[PDB]
């Protein structure tokens with residue numbers, strides 16, 4: 001717990017810890033949404049993790065992400081030492097500077113590339129699922145949630161699959177630190193890995209994501225090796241720690257809700273609308289910004305240098321944004337969320353993520369329409385910059401499945 005700063009008033013202190021929230025055993029989304037109870041203000045100060053503001057409502061999250069003159073991306077992580085070490089491109093830059101780097105990034109992970117990767121996504125999801133189908137059981141986090149998104153990413157990056165254990169270890173210490181490494185050691189270990197590769201593909205340009213970035217142009221000028229590395233690192237974390245977690249939340253829920261499985265088996269054309277609704281209910285990212293100057297926002301005096309966590313996860317969870325927000329409803333008419341961010345840094349990998357999610361639900365339910373949590377398992381969730389599921393044991397009767 002850190003010393004409450006002179007400028008923060010006693011009545012806005014709410015000691016929420018993002019890496020280990022109090023109600024965590026009820027579900028990570030449920031743990032986070034304690035900040036939306038009737039007793040809690042729209043903007044609190046927490047003394048954990050060195051101290052930082054936290055906006056709790058969708059209205060303030062969106063306003064702050066839009067206002068980059070006051071809410072800067074220069075130090076976007078908590079704790080303070082992680083945000084100061086954070087130098088990924090484009091995420092650590094504010095517009096106007098940030099803008100030229102998005103279109104290089106858009107070229108390696110945007111729609112055009114989802115279109116080059118279309119066959120391979122479909123094939124690996126069918127082949128992974130078909131290999132599990134006859135067993136009548138799986139450890140989903142390890143058997144599908146990781147290998148499906150991860151092997152597509154390594155394929156696109158032109159990186160070998162036995163580098164996976166090392167890279168996921170490191171990427172995961174930057175979002176859910178276990179204590180062994182600091183964000184900076186983790187980051188420098190990712191750059192160390194990328195350095196020879198980047199230089200080699202600048203001499204012999206290939207077709208893979210690293211070559212494209214490294215030999216890319218930024219509003220007409222050549223990107224440097226240091227910029228290539230800083231953009232490249234960011235793509236790996238996005239590739240190895242986003243969709244991987246998201247798929248486990250969605251499959252846990254489907255395993256617990258036979259009527260929602262039935263809806264999608266009956267009307268598979270509803271899968272894209274259902275993916276959106278699940279992205280709202282099982283939203284999982286929470287990063288933030290730093291104040292560029294002293295500023296008064298929604299009646300609270302903020303101080304230059306203060307950090308503020310603006311939980312992207314909380315906006316679609318807000319009862320002011322969606323009625324009965326904890327309830328999953330695939331026909332929800334206005335699905336409002338900030339799952340993929342808001343403002344000028346809107347997620348560049350969202351078209352890739354949505355395709356991987358929709359391909360997984362359609363291809364799973366086609367082959368293994370009925371499935372449940374294994375008898376007597378209690379699912380445990382984990383919290384951090386990106387939230388996730390520690391293990392998900394699923395069971396099914398092989399007599400009810402079909403090889404497609």
Ligand code: HEM
Pocket residue numbers: 076089090091092102105109153234235236238239242243246284285287288312339340341342344345346347348349350352353
């Ligand atoms: C469920 C999956 C995903 C979610 C929920 C998600 C969420 C986000 C969010 C919230 C941001 C903005 C953060 C900020 O403003 O500080 C972001 C940015 C970004 N994400 Fe995604 N992401 C996902 C998947 C991916 C994937 C699969 C990739 C690439 C392999 C990716 C690459 C990027 C990049 C490059 C940016 C930077 C945008 C910028 O700074 O201009 N993301 N993502």
Ligand SMILES: CC1(C)[C@@H]2CC[C@@]1(C)C(=O)C2
Pocket residue numbers: 088091175237238242285286287385386
């Ligand atoms: C907050 C994020 C999800 C977004 C993409 C990966 C992530 C950890 C960042 O560093 C940017």
Ligand SMILES: [K+]
Pocket residue numbers: 074075076083084085086087092
């Ligand atoms: K920084």
